Amino acid sequence: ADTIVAVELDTYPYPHIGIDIKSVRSKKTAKWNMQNGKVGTAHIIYNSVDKRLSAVVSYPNADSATVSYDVDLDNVLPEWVRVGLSASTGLYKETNTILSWSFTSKLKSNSTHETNALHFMFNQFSKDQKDLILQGDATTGTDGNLELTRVSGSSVGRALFYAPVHIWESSAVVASFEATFTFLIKSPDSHPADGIAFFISNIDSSIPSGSTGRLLGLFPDAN
Amino acid sequence: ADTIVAVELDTYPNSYPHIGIDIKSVRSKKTAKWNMQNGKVGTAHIIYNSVDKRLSAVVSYPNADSATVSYDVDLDNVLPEWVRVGLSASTGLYKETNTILSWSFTSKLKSNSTHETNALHFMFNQFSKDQKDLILQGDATTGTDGNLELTRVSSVGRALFYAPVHIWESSAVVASFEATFTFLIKSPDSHPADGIAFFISNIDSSIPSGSTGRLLGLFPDAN
Amino acid sequence: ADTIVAVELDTYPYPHIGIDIKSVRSKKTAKWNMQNGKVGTAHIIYNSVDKRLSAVVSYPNADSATVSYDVDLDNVLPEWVRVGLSASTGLYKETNTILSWSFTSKLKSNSTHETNALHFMFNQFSKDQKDLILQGDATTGTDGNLELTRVSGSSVGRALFYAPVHIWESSAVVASFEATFTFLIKSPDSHPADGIAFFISNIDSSIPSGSTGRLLGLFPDAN
Amino acid sequence: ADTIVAVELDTYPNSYPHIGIDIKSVRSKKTAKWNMQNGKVGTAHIIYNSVDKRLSAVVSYPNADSATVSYDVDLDNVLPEWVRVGLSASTGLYKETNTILSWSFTSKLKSNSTHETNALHFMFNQFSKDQKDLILQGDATTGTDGNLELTRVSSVGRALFYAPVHIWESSAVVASFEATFTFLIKSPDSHPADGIAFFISNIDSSIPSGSTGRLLGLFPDAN
Ligand SMILES: [Zn+2]
Numbered sequence A, C: 001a002d003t004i005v006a007v008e009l010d011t012y013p014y015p016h017i018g019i020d021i022k023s024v025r026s027k028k029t030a031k032w033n034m035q036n037g038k039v040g041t042a043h044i045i046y047n048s049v050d051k052r053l054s055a056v057v058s059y060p061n062a063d064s065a066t067v068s069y070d071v072d073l074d075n076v077l078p079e080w081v082r083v084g085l086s087a088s089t090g091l092y093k094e095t096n097t098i099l100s101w102s103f104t105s106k107l108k109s110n111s112t113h114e115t116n117a118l119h120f121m122f123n124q125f126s127k128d129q130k131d132l133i134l135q136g137d138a139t140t141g142t143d144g145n146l147e148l149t150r151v152s153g154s155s156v157g158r159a160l161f162y163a164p165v166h167i168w169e170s171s172a173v174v175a176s177f178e179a180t181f182t183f184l185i186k187s188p189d190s191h192p193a194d195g196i197a198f199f200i201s202n203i204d205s206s207i208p209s210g211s212t213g214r215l216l217g218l219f220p221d222a223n
Numbered sequence B, D: 001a002d003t004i005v006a007v008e009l010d011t012y013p014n015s016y017p018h019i020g021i022d023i024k025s026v027r028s029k030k031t032a033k034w035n036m037q038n039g040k041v042g043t044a045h046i047i048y049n050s051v052d053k054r055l056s057a058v059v060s061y062p063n064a065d066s067a068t069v070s071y072d073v074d075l076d077n078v079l080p081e082w083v084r085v086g087l088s089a090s091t092g093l094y095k096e097t098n099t100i101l102s103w104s105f106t107s108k109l110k111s112n113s114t115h116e117t118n119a120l121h122f123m124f125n126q127f128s129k130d131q132k133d134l135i136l137q138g139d140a141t142t143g144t145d146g147n148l149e150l151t152r153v154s155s156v157g158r159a160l161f162y163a164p165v166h167i168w169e170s171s172a173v174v175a176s177f178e179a180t181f182t183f184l185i186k187s188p189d190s191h192p193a194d195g196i197a198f199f200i201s202n203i204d205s206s207i208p209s210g211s212t213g214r215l216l217g218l219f220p221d222a223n
């Protein structure tokens, strides 16, 4: 199937932030205080020296939650990947609006003035966002935002950046990436089941069949 | 026909070697004398912004005089909203190369809104054998020393960045881009005919039939 | 006295955006529709190839105003300078709040991989902002903002970045800078006299005596 | 005494040449074997972030093995909120230089707020004779080839960036910095005693009396 590494924020049947390395059974999780209707901000960072994937989710007035996991991505992910955002809603009326998304990847060689870098920043999505590959119920343009799930009952959507990303190289001394997105989960329900995730996958990843709910449109089954 | 805007460096004795600005036609809209240095690494800096609406280029060599050409033009009226940017090169009948040692690009769309900037930035200082984020056309190849050989080493080649680029938007207060690339044109011949160009085209641009020589793999005819 | 180059927004006795090269008698001006109580955004840009200083002031819902002026800063300003913000209030109750300020300067040499760059971004000012030199009634910390004039009748204040800036060099092929600040001018009065300015000066510039009102704390007299 | 945090590269046979992390004391908190290469340009990459709270360093040479050392430490508890960053070097009694070919630094403070990042970034690829944005101490000088000679060419020298740096803030969700510098240690001697260090100190730090040799111009005594 696909190779997935993802930082997920879910409230399915307890809300927690977690790190998934190829399985929905989070390798590490942290208690998350999901704030309905408030804009949240996830910061994800990783570097080949530390070989540690770290995440921080904070809200204004701020209850930050953070989870880290030691892992050498060189052994998990393919050399070239595509990065993206995912979301799945349970049986509840709710949205998973992405207000902004920015990413930065760098490969520094042994070679002096070594650097290879890719950087994108979306602070406003357009109706025709040709540099985003939308999958599922994901769409753009709504207020300049990115609606991962359909806005108005079991919906899944994803948005991946068009250009493949050279996330690692055997001849780099330090490889590193950093992602940041601001989201808005609004539900009229008091305890909605929902999930958003920043994921890294093989370039041609697609929504597995049956990847709804707890599977975040990332995994085909709970193994 | 494709829509092309390109800054070209050519020595085809149509008639000194010159740097020139092409807006949809090979008969440069503006040109400047260029002192092509065989075997030395050169550096082209291209910059544009919607406020000034002036496309400018500077080509210098170490210990060098620089050559510069600017041209007033509102790209909003020439290019489509979404484009792809790339490098091109055509060799006449001479033994010579068109090695690109580095290429970096940055695009920015700043809206009327407070804190609404959209940006794309890539930097290649070392090209790998499998550069999956570059669309190679013609005789173009990568990996040779970590360089990009646009031409065969009567050759024509191009390399376009994979991700489409949002160059303009009707709602931006200042749209801008800036490109930089270092090249090496080596030829055993004393007066070789050659040509490199940084170009901006429609996303699905391809090498027109018979765009060899003085047509730089960009134009199908001068006529 | 001091050497001043500044992009000013004034409504003194008609509101206009203007470019001042060593004198308060703007070298070029544009009609400005001052919006009381609304956050505005000034973008200032300049590059040595074009040798043109350009400014854009827009508000949300947007009425943008823009003014450009052809000038080779190499002949006006000293090699090393300090950049800053200034404001002066007439006899009115009003504020000149700076919500954010960011600047970027680059010096690219003939030399391959030439770059020298300085970049700062303030999106939140602290009560002890040790990297800012405050002059006059200027203070920080108020909401995380920068109050150029005193907040509650003839007040002048300035804030300059601590580190001197190498704005030009004789051996650079392209020198360029770019500044952006968001301001809030709130006055209970319908037609208040006020002025804010982004200025470049000699490193040890200070508020001239009698630089109030129309003189923006930049000039000592109207010559 | 000054508060010093520094990543040091030393060959003083106190006992192989090593790279080490110093937190307020010259007796390194952590060290790694370093294979000092006489006459070859080296590259030190230093990185830290408040989420991981781990200070890491990588020193590589071309065609090289890299040496790396990391140390868990919350800088919030060691350093003052505002600091100055710099480079240091001390030579033993040998003929040798400590030329810094380039130095770049980036600091970021991201708040709980949506879109509230504060950043400082400098890049020196060429030092001029009058580098007004650098505070030189000891035998340090600039302009020599466009390089920075920390030591006399029993010498000690330092260079600190002029602007104080806000390294931490109690209200930031992720504070981070990253430094990179390329050096050249040439010595006619086969086993020279030498030392370079990237350090972070209180804004008004100065070379302690007798901080020569194995004290790297950073510490007044080991004892
Ligand atoms: Zn889970």
Ligand SMILES: [Zn+2]
Pocket: B010, B018, B020, B026, B028
């Ligand atoms: Zn031509």
Ligand SMILES: [Zn+2]
Pocket: C010, C018, C024, C026
């Ligand atoms: Zn005026």
Ligand SMILES: [Zn+2]
Pocket: D010, D018, D020, D026, D028
């Ligand atoms: Zn030691």
